Amino acid sequence: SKVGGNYNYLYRLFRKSNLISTEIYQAGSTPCNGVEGFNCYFPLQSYGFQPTN
């Protein structure tokens, strides 16, 4: 952690099924052919580690 927030650590938030790709996650029934947006999510989510947590 650091004063301005340490955001260098990622975790996977979305995946098709249970267990390092960045393929856009299709939440809906509409194919996500390269563009992220509604029901097309980037699969990774950053942590917000701060000295104040």
Partner: antibody, heavy 119, light 110 residues
């Protein structure tokens, strides 16, 4: 990657007309909404116009009502914005934007922008 | 109608937080206005950071967040960096697809 490339901007005479165009690549065109934005130099972004995913509906900011027309050709993966009675006041960089959001009113992916100068 | 207000400018020391705000002239900001936030550096096309109130794009630094305050939208930075100097714009939807941009809030780093 996902890209939008707009052009057609030029130095034109006021009172005349100008047709701008945007070519899309890297994604399926017929899946999303297309948005237009203009930015006058020294000013922030304004909103100009939109169009429905299937082309059945168009939408505009009141300031361009009756003056701007939007249509697209999904066979060419491109859209057009044509404006009549183009004003000298309307000097701006026009941007092509792709809207993949929930309501489809605002773009997520933006082109580099084409400069429209009227004189 | 098309009146969206923002604080004209903010100045924040590196590592400090920044709160940018955005509100309409009528009612209050809700998820129904699907608010957007953009960041524009001089000489460049604007980059979208936040969409549909709080969703972040893959190119959006995790430092930014689309929280809501007392009936108005905000964009909060968890730790300002020199790379964040830009004009930020907010965009609100209304009764239809006629978005209105805010005047813009210039954010600089001390």
């Amino acid at each position: 990657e996902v890209q939008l490339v707009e052009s057609g901007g030029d130095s034109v005479q006021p009172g005349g007309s100008l047709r701008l165009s945007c070519a899309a690549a890297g994604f399926t065109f017929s899946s999303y909404w297309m948005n237009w934005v203009r930015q006058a130099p020294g000013k922030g972004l304004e909103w100009v116009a939109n169009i429905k995913q299937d082309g059945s509906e168009k939408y505009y900011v009141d300031s361009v009502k009756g003056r701007f027309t939007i249509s697209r050709d999904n066979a060419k993966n491109s859209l057009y914005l044509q404006m009549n009675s183009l004003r000298a006041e309307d000097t701006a960089v026009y941007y092509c934007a792709l809207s993949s959001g929930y309501s489809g009113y605002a773009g997520n992916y933006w082109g580099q922008g084409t400069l429209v100068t009227v004189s | 109608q098309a009146v969206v207000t923002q604080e004209p400018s903010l100045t924040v020391s590196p590592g400090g937080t920044v709160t940018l705000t955005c509100g309409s002239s009528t009612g209050a900001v809700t998820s129904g206005h699907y608010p957007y936030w953009f960041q524009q550096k001089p000489g460049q096309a604007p980059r979208t950071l936040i969409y549909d109130t709080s969703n972040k794009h893959s190119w959006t630094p995790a430092r930014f967040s689309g929280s809501l305050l007392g009936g108005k939208a905000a964009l909060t930075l968890s730790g300002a960096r020199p790379e964040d100097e830009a004009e930020y714009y907010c965009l609100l939807s209304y009764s239809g697809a006629r978005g209105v941009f805010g005047g813009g809030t210039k954010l600089t780093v001390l």
